[PDB]
Design a binder for this molecule. Sequence first.
Ligand SMILES: [Ca+2]
Lengths: 121, 132
Amino acid sequence: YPYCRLTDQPLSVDEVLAAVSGPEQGGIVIFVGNVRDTRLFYEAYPPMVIRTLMSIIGRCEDKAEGVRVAVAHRTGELQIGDAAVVIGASAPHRAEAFDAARMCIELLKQEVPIWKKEFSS
Amino acid sequence: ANVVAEGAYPYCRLTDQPLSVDEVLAAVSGPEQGGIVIFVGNVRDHNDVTRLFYEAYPPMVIRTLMSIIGRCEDKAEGVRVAVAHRTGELQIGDAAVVIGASAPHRAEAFDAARMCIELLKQEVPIWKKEFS
Ligand SMILES: [Ca+2]
């Protein structure tokens, strides 16, 4: 199965990178979505979100041969500098890894149902 | 062997040692960088060892990389690009290049990363041979 995580813990670039690596993957694209410049919370129902993430991964891998996609999304409280999402896509060639990573994040942004809360301490 | 531009310098590293995603990632991170894209170009197999060298003097290659970075950064506001490049003897699976690009938003980060690798491949001349 693909690497597909929804967690309250800091995301791992190492893990996403490893999930997507392999002898035949010449190109790897990794997207990191960081929190920019006050408290921030992500609230989600994990079963629904994870299912949605799996759907997205399947559609992205479907575009070209040898394409591997991994996704990690964070929930809970976040700080400036924290990764909210980490996406990895690999392919024999760089074009297909760029295509899959970009497709993955656009779909995620459009589809993953999430509540965003902002208040001030 | 390692040469790296640190501080205010744009991140540029030439080495014969294993590359690091984390270092490149840190190099383009910032309070206002909301979207970050990393490209890793790996040695893959076509039926086990690859030797890679510059066709030019390393300082010439650095000038080239620094110029490429400048141009990629000039395309939009808040764009940061970083390049790590490895030569010598590499294994199947080894990273030959790690590129990082960041920006306030994701679109410019993807643009910068893609532009960077494209300019690199057409402007940085590399001696490449496969061995057994
Ligand atoms: Ca050549």
